[PDB]
Ligand binder design. Sequence first.
Ligand SMILES: NCc1cccc(OCc2ccc(Cl)cc2)c1
Ligand SMILES: NCc1cccc(OCc2ccc(Cl)cc2)c1
Ligand SMILES: NCc1cccc(OCc2ccc(Cl)cc2)c1
Ligand SMILES: NCc1cccc(OCc2ccc(Cl)cc2)c1
Lengths: 396, 396, 396, 396
Amino acid sequence: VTLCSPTEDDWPGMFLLAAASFTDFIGPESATAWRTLVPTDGAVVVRDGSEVVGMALYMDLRLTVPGEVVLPTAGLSFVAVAPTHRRRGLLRAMCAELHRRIADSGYPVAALHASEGGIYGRFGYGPATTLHELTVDRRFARFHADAPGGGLGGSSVRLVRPTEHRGEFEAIYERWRQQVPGGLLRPQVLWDELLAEAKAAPGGDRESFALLHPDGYALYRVDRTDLKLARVSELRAVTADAHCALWRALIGLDSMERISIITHPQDPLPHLLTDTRLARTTWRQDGLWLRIMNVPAALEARGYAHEVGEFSTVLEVSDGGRFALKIGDGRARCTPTDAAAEIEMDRDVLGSLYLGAHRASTLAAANRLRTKDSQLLRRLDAAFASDVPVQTAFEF
Amino acid sequence: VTLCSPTEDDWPGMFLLAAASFTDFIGPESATAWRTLVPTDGAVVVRDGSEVVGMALYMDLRLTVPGEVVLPTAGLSFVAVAPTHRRRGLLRAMCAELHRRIADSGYPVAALHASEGGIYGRFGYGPATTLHELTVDRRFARFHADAPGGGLGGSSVRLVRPTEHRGEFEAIYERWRQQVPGGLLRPQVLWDELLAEAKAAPGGDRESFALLHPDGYALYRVDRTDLKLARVSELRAVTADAHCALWRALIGLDSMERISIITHPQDPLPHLLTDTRLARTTWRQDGLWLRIMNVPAALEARGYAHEVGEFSTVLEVSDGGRFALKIGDGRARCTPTDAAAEIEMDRDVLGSLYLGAHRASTLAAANRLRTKDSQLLRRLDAAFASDVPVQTAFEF
Amino acid sequence: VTLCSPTEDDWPGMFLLAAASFTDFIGPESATAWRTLVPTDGAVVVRDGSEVVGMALYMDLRLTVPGEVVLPTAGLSFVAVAPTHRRRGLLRAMCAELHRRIADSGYPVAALHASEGGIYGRFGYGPATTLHELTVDRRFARFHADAPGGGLGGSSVRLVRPTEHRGEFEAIYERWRQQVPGGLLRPQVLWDELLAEAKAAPGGDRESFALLHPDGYALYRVDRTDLKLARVSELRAVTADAHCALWRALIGLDSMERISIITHPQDPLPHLLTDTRLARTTWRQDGLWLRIMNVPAALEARGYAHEVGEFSTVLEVSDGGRFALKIGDGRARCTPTDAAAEIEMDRDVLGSLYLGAHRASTLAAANRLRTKDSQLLRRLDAAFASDVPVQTAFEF
Amino acid sequence: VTLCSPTEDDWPGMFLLAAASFTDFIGPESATAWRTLVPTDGAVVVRDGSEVVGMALYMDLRLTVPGEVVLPTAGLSFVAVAPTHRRRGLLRAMCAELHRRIADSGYPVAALHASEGGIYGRFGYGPATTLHELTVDRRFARFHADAPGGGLGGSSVRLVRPTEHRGEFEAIYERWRQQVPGGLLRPQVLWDELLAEAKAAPGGDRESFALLHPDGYALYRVDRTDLKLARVSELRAVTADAHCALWRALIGLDSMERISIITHPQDPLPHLLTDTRLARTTWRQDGLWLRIMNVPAALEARGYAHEVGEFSTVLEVSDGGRFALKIGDGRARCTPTDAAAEIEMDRDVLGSLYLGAHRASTLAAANRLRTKDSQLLRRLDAAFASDVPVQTAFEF
Ligand SMILES: NCc1cccc(OCc2ccc(Cl)cc2)c1
Ligand SMILES: NCc1cccc(OCc2ccc(Cl)cc2)c1
Ligand SMILES: NCc1cccc(OCc2ccc(Cl)cc2)c1
Ligand SMILES: NCc1cccc(OCc2ccc(Cl)cc2)c1
């Protein structure tokens, strides 16, 4: 078993392992498009001699963190071990090599979407966003008197064919991803892929439509088997008015019984209706996972809540060093120290705090975060909270 | 149709309307026990002449709010309109009369559990706690290395018959309800009712067992139809160690496939496992609803986050007056003013903010809360947040 | 943690652990009746000091093995570890103590029914009978021209109330259990229990009826929820005519769509119909598990197939000694030797061969049985086969 | 209604009846390939005058029987009566004509797969193999310490694309079918068909993969609707090591919850796991059906168990003659006699005994086999048993 960067000849073998590992495998054509996001030396393979029994790679991404700061992010993807080669340490070896290359290349953070919840914790990835599925029984849904855009006169929303308004979707998404923690820059090849998936497939997905507002869009399709369910694949709204206008249009889909969307826990939709309970939480899961590669670069890069006064502490990450951490006026300074630790946690836990999806108090109650000072806990909770709620951009 | 306080002769008629209105109707014997919590003049009935076509009442409760402050609370319950008398304004008339008596009696807050999500908003009740069902597939569940009580030697938890340890359950619950926002004082008659429901019923619920720790208990029973599901009716833990010790015992129920509990969104259970995803969110609903009866008494009574600096604003409640609100050092002063409003909201919205379950920012994005100052929003969010996560005590 | 024989005072604590461990817990009254089958020193408990955190016991049973030989059998039952005390070696300690007492008392075999398939292998128990559920869609079922009892004139079968023909059921079962491998002697207290379970229970099982023939009976009841399914709890037939006559009567239950029974893989029922496929296998599971306590006493006690010629080999049981085994004229002699082993297997594997339910060839193909001689395999398969197919008597 | 051999002009009409009769109809292209296995005069049609209202044919196959003996076998297939022409005796007439041609041509046995269990018994076909579906919950599956290939170092199994290793699959299958009773020689055109079905179909089956060992292969695909189920279409292992190595690889499919396979009752898979119960029997059905065309040629052709001593009897087949049958040293002689019958049975029953899937004792208990001598029964059971368990090759 030898771990080396993959040659051009290995890609057919890598595509075979992919096809056998990923039931949602996007196909060799789509794989070749995402692969334009993989840098030179961004991929490893394990060869049994000979054939590919293991692979892993990272893509060059840009991730928005609290304070509207954009970090270079290594997005791990296409991770597979052959069913013939389990329990041989191949995933551990591939992750150690990519982490070395990611850290040497200067990335402050790595990120992934997890096939299972029990694998990536031990390599330092913490779940950092929360997927929340809402299903609305739109036959009962009535908008609250307070909800925006209840006035008479033309709708600001249009029903359109996605492929004919690419420019407008691109510009609205660019504005969205720069203002929301969890936002990811979407390159042209991923717009090519998204618009190609919006066509109907024989014996597959039905056609996608769009609802378009100057400051937001929704892409939706009727479910392939449940013909009374519309699934919203993506709703991106830059203003509260755009969000409300798009939901009025979706609740106007009078053919449907139910509208479902994978959104975030702080989605205001329920509060737009006279019955908040009509927006039912039907599913909840970890979304994006983060590994903080450089503790001080990551902690100094993001913005913090202005509402907490200046404080200083000492944070130890279990294998990531010990730092004097001073947070004031929305900014952190994070410098080496050998002074006694006031807070300890594993690296994964810092990833789970980093975008504001998990409270320090909640992690402390599980003993994943350790301090003897409950005032310091309250200050950490307040400082790491995100003013703009964390959202999940798109899977990779 | 006449609305009057019910006489002794009306209770059989009220029990008939109850039996026909509530499929979960607790029965005349249990009804007579809860009724010891109803004060003189705490009940109204509507008579068609003659017979009972409408009823409503409140109980004298004690509700813990952020800062460990206990408020006298009017708990509305036993609310029913006859199926013969819909759309005649009976619920509106009964709620106006009880609200008048509740306000004249000096209660700062009223509370209820809602049969439907669309009814109580218009009478000024806002959903103020969130029920979160977690289902654990305990066959995969392994505790994280960091989780407390992983050491060898005797368990601190005992499997017991609930009826033989009443005193210990009472003392642990009393400690729990005083330290948690949403806590309700549980009177002796409700302990009599709880321990009576823990016996098996022929063709009904199976026997309840308890897991007992010095600082917490869990009551559980096997589901009547799904024999591989244990339902935890109630887990009350005063320390993180008690919470972890009780979950180790519940995951030791090797006969079961699944353990379910109705808990709160900040339950640390997921963080205790190596796979956070095993603790699946299977259901989410409003729990306790609050109506703020006296805005200034309620706002001054609760404690606020110490992490936000002193600030002053003007809050208008749509039919509840306008107040100069100054929040500093964890305390509010809330005094009459005719100065221009900086924040407006309906009374229900204030109930939804009051225990920290809903962010002002989330309600503002739905236009349920209106201000032109985004800094004031951030300050309100931070100040109304609860250090101790809001929990739901018991339905009424 | 101390392991000791249980005192009279411990039984309430043992009944509490039982109630919490066994959803099918038969209740304190029934427990007290089965307990008349437990000998002095047949039970162990583990006390945390104080309270019962572990228990296990054996009953005195009589088990029929091939050749119509009846062995004294220790039937393990009522085995439970408290959910508070998992992963502390309590089951291993309780099984070692009972096995010591069972071996010192002179039992050649122990037996149990397994709550799960992965626990008892490591203590030397092998699955030794196979439960096979057949479901017949009786609306299509027609008897083959060859099937016995197709003649005109009175039926030999009567529909009766079980409690009014106890004597006849007892005598037919006594004849059945002595002629079938897997048969268990059923004592009077277990007839008291069986006839008590045949009454309807409010919100529970419906009434049981019997079909009675001079040489067989069936006990059946309509399923509590599926009102078109009759479940046969027990069919005991001493002759092929009794078996066919009883199935003609069961297929005469014209109210039902389906008849189900838990039987054995060699049940001739399918061959009685013109469409063998109507007798559908809906479920298959291990039934009785055996631990051979004394290899030579067990191997010499049972009869062997007369169709295989005399042969000699050397059998090693992994921690059970090495024996010269000579099988001829349906009889084995099994004597100590230090000569080289020709066959090796763990003790559990010998239990799985002992009643003829599993072929040596099948176990050899899994490498659970090891020999270099394929002729010896064929001879072992032929010699351990049972002329009378193995059946499962009743759970304990 | 006239029964005649079909002309070239009739095939479109035969393809129309096929399309309307067989929901699994393989299509005209595939039909044309299987048709290369039909001899001149191997097909009959019934014409209403005019159009095809009935058809039936046989293919030239080679069937392995106990003793590794290969018989020429007439494989009936493509049997259909028009829904317009039921209850007119068309199937009986078509089967009598083909049976005449099959017997005159010199075939000792005919075979088929039955659409229903109640049709072919009366034409002399007995079910002769048993399909057994095992479903493994691979998330719990752990291999027993005794299981082969538990050592460290390279796997002997490779994940491959089926179409790129045709030669290796062909050679492994050829070795398998010659050593296993029920094996069928697979001609080149059926390899062309098998490899064509391994490609993904739009709105149809997903892509098939292979696991390849020097001495075995498995072909599997993810189920089209249940994305956590892998279905093994075919596993052919010549050694126990190949069988164990392939199952280790299949249980390494970490994306799946369940692996299912249609195998035989003696599959050793359950015995490879620490929990035998994880390999659940989810379905059981007759597989291949046999009609013995020439009793003496069939009885003398197959090998018998060497473990039973020489014996002689007289067997009468109900319309198939009476024979002196002498079985000794694994060989039978079967000669005409008018001596009194000691064993009687219909022709279908002999087909059910012929490959060892059904015991004579089991058929005797249903009175499908009649003798007054229970010693002769035991000898027949032992002699007709197959050392190598009967498997089902492929449907036709
Ligand atoms: N989990 C489905 C999903 C969704 C989107 C992208 C995706 O693969 C990304 C990817 C594929 C191939 C390569 Cl070379 C690099 C990256 C998978
Ligand atoms: N929703 C079920 C439920 C649960 C607990 C109490 C309950 O009724 C409370 C109550 C009943 C009767 C009276 Cl006079 C006063 C109060 C209903
Ligand atoms: N698994 C259900 C079942 C069925 C029959 C008997 C049974 O317990 C047997 C038993 C119970 C109590 C005692 Cl002291 C001794 C033996 C359990
Ligand atoms: N039952 C499905 C199935 C599976 C495989 C073959 C098959 O038809 C075989 C066949 C088809 C056409 C002809 Cl001319 C001859 C033979 C049917």
